Amino acid sequence: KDFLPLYFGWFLTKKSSETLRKAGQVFLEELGNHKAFKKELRHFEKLELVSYFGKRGPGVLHCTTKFCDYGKAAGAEEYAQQEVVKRSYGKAFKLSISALFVTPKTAGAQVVLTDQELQLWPSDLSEGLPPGSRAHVTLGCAADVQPVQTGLDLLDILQQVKGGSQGEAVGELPRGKLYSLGKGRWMLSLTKKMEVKAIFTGYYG
Ligand SMILES: Nc1ncnc2c1ncn2[C@@H]1O[C@H](CO)[C@@H](O)[C@H]1OP(=O)(O)O
Ligand SMILES: [Cl-]
Ligand SMILES: [Cl-]
C-alpha cells in the first residue's frame, strides 16, 4: 500500500503566502503597539510579538485539513481514500480569511470554508460548533508550543464569541475591529475578508 502524506491541506501560492505573512506581521506589530494590549500584558518595556511567535513554518503558509502522519494517525487511510480528496488533489482553491487572532501560545488566521471546501474537511471519531471552524493558517508559535495548539486556540476563541464574551471592541485597526477575550486572547475581525489562492495537495516532509 502507498503510504499517505504527513498531512493534507491547501497550500498557498508564493503571492498569497507572502500577502498573508505580511498581513500577519503588521497585525502583530500593531497589536504590540496598541495601548489596550499593554495593560493586559500581565494576563498575557515593550513586547514585540513577531519575536514572541518565533516558531513559524518552512515559509509556505498552509491550511491543514487532515493530519495523517503518513498513515499512523486515526482515520488517515479512511480520509485519503475519499473520492473528493483524490479528485481535488492538485486543484486550486480560494480560501477566505475572516479574522486574525493571537493567544499566549499561537497566532494565526481564521479560515472560512466554502461548502465544496467543506467536503475536503475531515470528520473523524469541539461541541456545538459547525465543522470547519477549526480551519486556520498558523502564523507563528511560542517556543514551547506544539503546532497542534493553533487549531485548538481558535476553537476555544470561537466558543466564547458565540457566547458574546468578546463584547465591545477595544480598538479599531485600519483593516478590522480589535477584540479582547481575556486570558491573553485577541481577535481581529477583518472588515473585508482576505481571499488567498492555494493548492490542495499532500505534504510528505
Ligand atoms: N495531532 C497533531 N499532531 C501533530 N501535528 C498536527 C496534528 N494535527 C494537525 N497537525 C498539523 O501538523 C503539522 C506540523 O507542522 C501542523 O501543520 C499541524 O497543523 P497546524 O499547523 O495548522 O496547527
Ligand atoms: Cl486539523
Ligand atoms: Cl471542527
Point out the ligand 1 atom lying closest to the alpha carbon of residue 62: 22
Q: Give the Å distances, CA to CA, from 18 to 21, 23, 25, 90, 192.
A: 5, 8, 10, 20, 18
Distance between start and end Cα atoms, the chain: 19
DSSP 8-state assignment for residue 105: S
Contacts of 164 (CB under 8 A, 6+ apart): none
Pocket test for ligand 1, best of 8, 62, 64 (most atoms within 8 A of CB): 64
Which helix (H) or strand (E) segment is 31 a member of? helix 14-33
Task: Return the number of other C-beta atoms located less than 10 Å from residue 84's C-beta.
Answer: 12
Check if the beta carbon of residue 98 is closer than 8 Å to that of residue 157: no
- Residue pair 139/108 in contact (Cβ under 8 Å)? The answer is yes
Q: In this structure, what C-alpha cell is assigned to residue 158?
A: 470561537
Nearest atom (ligand 1) to Cα of 63: 22
Q: What's the reported resolution, in angstroms, to a tenth? A: 2.7
- Pocket lining for ligand 1, CB < 6 angstroms: 7, 64, 67, 136, 138, 147-148, 150-151
Nine cell digits for residue 40: 493586559
Experimental method: X-ray
Cα–Cα dist 121/125, whole Å: 13
Name the binding residues for substrate: 64, 138
The residue whose grid cell reads 513559524 is 56
Q: Are strands 185-203 and 176-182 parallel, antiparallel or unpaired?
A: antiparallel
Given the CA of residue 149, which atom of ligand 1 is nearest to it? Answer: 23
Q: Gaps in the chain (C–N > 2.5 Å) come after which residues? A: 44, 125
Residue holding cell 518595556? 45
How distant, in Å, are the alpha carbons of 63, 144, 158, 202 from that of 135?
Answer: 7, 22, 12, 16
Q: Which residues pair with 194 in a beta bridge?
A: 97
For CA atoms 57, 60, 66, 72, the dihedral sign is: negative
In one-letter notation, the amino acid at residue 1 is: K
CA gap 70, 44 in Å, rounded: 36
Sign for the CA dihedral angle at 108, 113, 118, 120 comes to negative
Q: Which domain holds residue 52?
A: 1-205
What whole-number distance in Å separates Cα of residue 79 and Cα of residue 71?
10
Three-state DSSP state, 137: strand
**Cβ pair 10, 200 in contact under 8 A:** yes
Give the Cα separation of 70 and 168 in Å (integer): 44
| Nearest one of 136, 168, 128 to 152, comparing CA atoms | 136
Residue nearest to atom 1 of ligand 1 (CA): 148
34 given a catalytic annotation: no
Residue whose cell numbers read 495601548: 35
Cα dist from 54 to 28, 74, 176, 194, whole Å: 12, 30, 24, 24
In angstroms, what is the span from residue 115 Cα to ligand 3's centroid? 14
Which one from 136, 139, 179, 200 is the annotated catalytic residue? 136
**85 Cα: distance to centroid of ligand 3 (angstroms):** 17
Residue 132 to residue 103: CA distance in whole angstroms? 20
The total domain count for the chain is: 1
Q: Looking at residue 154, what DSSP letter applies?
A: H
CB 75 within 8 A of CB 124: yes
- Tell me the CA–centroid distance for residue 156 and ligand 3, in Å: 11
H or E element that contains 192: strand 185-203
**Domain holding 125: CATH number?**
3.90.1740.10
